[PDB]
Amino acid sequence: GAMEVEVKLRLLTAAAHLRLTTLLTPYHLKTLHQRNTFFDTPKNDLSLRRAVLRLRFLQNAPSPPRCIVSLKAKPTLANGISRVEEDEEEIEYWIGKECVESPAKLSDIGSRVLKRVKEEYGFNDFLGFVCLGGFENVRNVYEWRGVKLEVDETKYDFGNCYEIECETEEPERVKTMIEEFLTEEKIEFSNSDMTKFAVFRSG
Ligand SMILES: [Mn+2]
Ligand SMILES: [Mn+2]
Ligand SMILES: [Mn+2]
Numbered sequence: 001g002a003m004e005v006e007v008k009l010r011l012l013t014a015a016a017h018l019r020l021t022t023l024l025t026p027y028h029l030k031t032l033h034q035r036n037t038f039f040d041t042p043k044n045d046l047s048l049r050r051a052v053l054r055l056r057f058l059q060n061a062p063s064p065p066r067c068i069v070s071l072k073a074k075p076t077l078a079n080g081i082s083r084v085e086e087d088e089e090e091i092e093y094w095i096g097k098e099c100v101e102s103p104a105k106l107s108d109i110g111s112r113v114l115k116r117v118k119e120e121y122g123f124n125d126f127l128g129f130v131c132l133g134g135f136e137n138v139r140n141v142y143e144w145r146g147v148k149l150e151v152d153e154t155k156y157d158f159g160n161c162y163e164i165e166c167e168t169e170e171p172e173r174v175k176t177m178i179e180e181f182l183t184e185e186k187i188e189f190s191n192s193d194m195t196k197f198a199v200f201r202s203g
């Protein structure tokens with residue numbers, strides 16, 4: 001896949017998130033509703049091999065909903081900067097939906113990314129796969145000071161988390177730019193030190 005490098009900062013409270021979104025209002029591009037679902041074997045074969053297989057269902061807040069399969073491999077997250085190999089592919093929404101219900105049907109899709117999962121992790125089909133479940137995320141996208149800010153409200157069972165992400169080839173310079181702004185505006189933040197998937201799996 002391609003290498004995804006992104007700044008990842010946690011907004012520490014719902015208030016911090018609300019204040020930031022209000023401050024960024026004039027820079028708003030779009031709002032996305034995401035439902036993230038995850039698949040693995042019951043033995044956690046992908047997870048133990050540092051891989052995450054996501055089906056993301058996406059909808060704008062014509063706006064057909066969309067399903068994107070993502071394989072993320074060999075992630076690192078340190079100092080508020082994430083780097084991971086990401087391979088993505090759009091598939092038919094109805095097909096994605098059926099796979100959440102019946103994960104063995106991943107075997108019936110004909111997807112490039114799924115073929116890569118088979119080849120690299122050594123499966124001949126997805127008959128032994130299960131859905132780990134998922135979580136919703138509301139992503140506000142802003143075009144601010146030359147970057148694309150993605151401000152996330154992630155809704156888990158146990159409660160909500162809030163983050164700012166920014167995909168960039170200059171994460172140190174962009175992270176400093178964002179941090180200066182948050183500090184000036186007295187927004188409560190820290191580096192994120194867990195992926196959304198890891199938070200989800202920790203309960
Ligand atoms: Mn990505
Ligand atoms: Mn991210
Ligand atoms: Mn990203």
